[PDB]
Design a binder for this molecule. Structure first.
Ligand SMILES: CC[C@@H](CNc1ncnc2nc[nH]c12)NC(=O)CC1CCCCC1
Length: 167
């Protein structure tokens, strides 16, 4: 038993809710919150800008030191950093950004990072400002992630469409 509330059950291991990931994080304080990152860990908008704003920019400061030491992430890759005031850890995961021309096949690789963590609070990768089909992202999630994932979808209208089309 965990502390996530009002999630609809999609599969054995995938749950979904119409919620702002920042508000879910602040209420739950999960072990892992997933950030929808880019390779430079420049957290400007969408999930990344919203989480970073909620950390008072501490996420960005930590991320800049990470990049200065390690260089950019790979598309499809990830790193574990602090969750600051939102979670124990933040798993920064880079899904492909279709609005930049990146291979959508890399979305499966991105979701594979979730399997290194038993339970995660996460957004829909590559969707929203990253430009990919959200129904496809949810499908890849369900077909790739084997650990327990609690998906927070910000847009109400999209959430209704995702559930109603899941089948
Ligand atoms: C589906 C991914 C999600 C990612 N963004 C966020 N996901 C969770 N919590 C967040 N808090 C702040 N941003 C958050 N984007 C949205 O839902 C917005 C809709 C995308 C399609 C077109 C209509 C808008």
């Amino acid at each position: 038993v965990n502390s996530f509330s009002g999630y609809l059950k999609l599969t054995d291991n995938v749950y979904i809710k119409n919620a702002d990931i920042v508000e879910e994080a602040k209420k739950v304080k999960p072990t892992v919150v997933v950030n929808a990152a880019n390779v430079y860990l420049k957290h400007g908008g969408g999930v990344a800008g919203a989480l970073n704003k909620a950390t008072n920019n501490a996420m960005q400061v930590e991320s800049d030191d990470y990049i200065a030491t390690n260089g950019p992430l790979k598309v499809g890759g990830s790193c574990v950093l602090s969750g600051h005031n939102l979670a124990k850890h933040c798993l920064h995961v880079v899904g492909p950004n279709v609005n930049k021309g990146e291979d959508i096949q890399l979305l499966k690789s991105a979701y594979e990072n979730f399997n290194q963590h038993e339970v995660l609070l996460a957004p829909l990768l590559s969707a929203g400002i990253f430009g990919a089909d959200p129904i496809h992202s949810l499908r890849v999630c369900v077909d790739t992630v084997r650990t327990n994932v609690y998906l927070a979808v910000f847009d109400k209208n999209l959430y209704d469409k995702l559930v109603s089309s899941f089948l």
